[PDB]
Design a protein around this ligand. Structure first.
Ligand SMILES: Nc1ncnc2c1ncn2[C@@H]1O[C@H](COP(=O)(O)OP(=O)(O)OP(=O)(O)O)[C@@H](O)[C@H]1O
Ligand SMILES: [Zn+2]
Ligand SMILES: [Zn+2]
Length: 613
């Protein structure tokens, strides 16, 4: 039966590469069914402007050694073995009953006003022709080369329609995962650093089909705060401090922000079944299509991944498994947020004495009743005590028993990161120490007496990333525009950091004022890209921090960067500032040599001197 569901995809591959197809070099796979291999060509960059603008950071290992990804077969195999070739154990019956109730409640709540609907060809095309199918990583669109000309060709859509017909017939032929490579470990403090993660691609057609059947979850903002209560989908990172500060404003215990150790390796068949309840929000064709996506591409997966073989040779392995997720899906962020809300509701019920460790193997009827009653009476309020974005969460429980409420959490395989399994969680009395979506947030006072809540994170990581250039095919122009994008992003979000204000300004002084920022500064669903512009950044700043800031009452425009605040020196240094050092002072004093050196490489252009201060 599982055999049956993957047969067609395997047969397609076995036939396309019948030439080199063989059955295995002692294959490494332990939890994945191995089908065979074939021969392939193995797969596997500094920003000059930012580099030149950041001389002191040449002495800092976090910056100089930074790498994003490893798409070699070696890196594919490493990440596959560490992160994908594992199986989370199913939770026991009581826990299942608690998650069953909890997810029934959450689905009823998310669907209270929003109605599910198909997304469309034209919606997808519009999505593709922009700031992207951002992160649902895109691409086999192999013969067009880019996604834009692929969606522009009627032949692409005929392929889509054919596979759509197969789905409607209960079969899947082409919808196959490719593990393109490894996203390296990201920096963080203990309990917050992200481990390496797999990078998944599928054919563009597969992405369309997924998007059509389930993309409404994203496109109609099912996980927005307004709809989900605990979610924050749609909000810029500049809203998130304010949201934490409102949560902090409620009466309760400390604030907790436990990460799961590798969330995407820890979702169980149970979590999938509860997610799959989405099917009953659906009717007719819509449901048929979504059912095919869930049953055939989410559950019965087929996966291609590279492996090093004999003579500096590379094979592609073909493997399958009755599985769950990994990301690489169009709705991975939405469903992670759903399941993680449910997870936090369960933990809150344990923390509030509704359920205990006696209940894991079996949930007594009396407790089932109390569970349902607690969700009915408290769900809507408890959800507002949370900020959940994917696997990132912050929660403010009623009281600090939450610290020890770990039985259901561990039984659900949602083991917390970098803390011993049964050690109570650490919570914070101060909302400004709480980490969330790679930031913490600081309330700072401006000269005019008004205050703002600004995002803050390790400066080395920011500088390190800006120094990276994805382009083999980036112009002098594209490099300077990307440097510009980073600089302007720092001006909108991290202006309060002295080195970043200074570095951003020097970069904007060095790059032609009429050049439009291009490229990508962040993968986060929370970076909205207000800095991708040639508009004067202070006006953008005013619009974001004053005008459209619903926590800003007095709408009085700020007129000069002079009146835009910095964090206290203590903070700045804490999060990696180089102020106070001889290196950074030499740097501030000689910056102009670097600027003019850039202006001299780029050539005769309209420039502006932004080092007024
Ligand atoms: N479940 C999730 N999956 C992927 N990204 C998430 C999830 N939840 C939140 N995020 C966002 O992604 C960021 C970190 O993981 P990611 O791989 O996206 O690197 P990144 O976001 O590009 O780094 P950065 O935040 O500087 O852009 C977090 O800051 C957060 O804003
Ligand atoms: Zn398919
Ligand atoms: Zn900070």
């Amino acid at each position: 039966s599982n055999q049956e569901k993957i047969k067609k995809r395997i047969q397609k591959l076995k036939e396309e590469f019948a030439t080199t197809w063989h059955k295995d070099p002692e294959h490494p796979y332990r939890t994945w069914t191995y089908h065979g291999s074939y021969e392939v060509k193995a797969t596997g960059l500094v920003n000059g402007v930012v580099k030149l603008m950041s001389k002191p950071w040449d002495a800092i290992a976090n910056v100089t050694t930074m790498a994003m990804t490893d798409t070699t077969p070696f890196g594919q195999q490493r990440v596959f073995k560490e992160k994908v070739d594992t199986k989370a154990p199913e939770p026991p019956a009581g826990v299942r009953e608690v998650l069953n109730e909890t997810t029934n409640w959450l689905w009823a709540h998310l669907s209270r006003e929003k109605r599910p609907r198909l997304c469309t060809k034209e919606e997808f095309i519009k999505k593709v022709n922009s700031n992207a199918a951002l992160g649902a990583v895109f691409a086999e669109q192999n013969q067009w080369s880019t996604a834009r000309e692929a969606v522009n060709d009627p032949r692409f859509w005929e392929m889509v329609d054919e596979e759509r017909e197969n789905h409607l017939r209960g079969e899947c032929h082409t919808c196959i995962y490719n593990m393109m490579g490894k996203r390296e470990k990201k920096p963080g403090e203990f309990g917050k650093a992200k481990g390496s993660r797999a990078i998944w691609f599928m054919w563009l057609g597969a992405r369309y089909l997924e998007f059509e059947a389930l993309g409404f979850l994203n496109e109609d903002h099912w996980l927005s705060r307004e709809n989900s209560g605990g979610g924050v989908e749609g909000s810029g990172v500049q809203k998130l401090g304010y949201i934490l500060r409102d949560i902090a404003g409620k009466q309760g215990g400390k604030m907790y922000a436990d990460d799961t150790a590798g969330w995407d390796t820890r979702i169980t068949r149970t979590d999938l079944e509860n997610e799959a309840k989405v099917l009953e929000l659906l009717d007719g064709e819509h449901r048929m299509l979504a059912r095919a996506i869930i049953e055939l591409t989410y559950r019965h997966k087929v996966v291609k991944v590279m492996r090093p073989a004999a003579e500096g040779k590379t094979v592609m392995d073909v493997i399958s498994r009755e599985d769950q997720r990994g990301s690489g899906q169009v709705v991975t962020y939405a469903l992670n947020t759903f399941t993680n809300i449910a997870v936090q509701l369960v933990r809150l019920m344990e923390a509030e004495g509704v359920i205990g460790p006696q209940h894991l193997e079996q949930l007594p009827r009396k407790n089932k009743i109390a569970v349902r009653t607690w969700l009915f009476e408290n769900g809507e309020e408890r959800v507002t005590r949370m900020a959940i974005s994917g696997d990132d969460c912050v929660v403010k429980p009623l009281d600090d028993r939450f610290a020890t409420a770990l039985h259901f959490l561990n039984a659900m395989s949602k083991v917390r990161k970098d803390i011993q399994e049964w050690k109570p969680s650490h919570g914070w009395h101060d909302w400004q120490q709480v980490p969330f979506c790679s930031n913490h947030f600081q309330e700072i006072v401006m000269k005019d007496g008004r205050s703002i809540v600004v995002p803050c994170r390790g400066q080395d990581e920011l500088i390190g990333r800006a120094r990276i250039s994805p382009g083999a095919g980036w112009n002098v122009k594209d490099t300077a525009c990307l440097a510009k994008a980073y600089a302007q992003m720092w001006l909108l979000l991290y202006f309060h950091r002295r080195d970043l204000r200074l570095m951003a300004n020097a970069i904007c002084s060095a790059v032609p004022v009429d050049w439009v920022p291009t490229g990508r500064t962040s993968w986060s669903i929370h970076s909205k890209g207000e800095w991708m512009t040639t508009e004067d950044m202070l006006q953008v700043w005013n619009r974001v921090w004053i005008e459209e800031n619903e926590w800003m009452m007095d709408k009085t425009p700020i007129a000069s960067w002079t009146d835009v605040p910095y964090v206290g020196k203590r903070e700045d240094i804490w999060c990696g500032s180089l102020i106070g050092t001889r290196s950074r002072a030499t740097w501030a004093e000689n910056i102009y040599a670097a600027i003019n050196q850039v202006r001299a490489v780029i050539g005769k252009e309209n420039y502006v001197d932004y080092m007024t201060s």
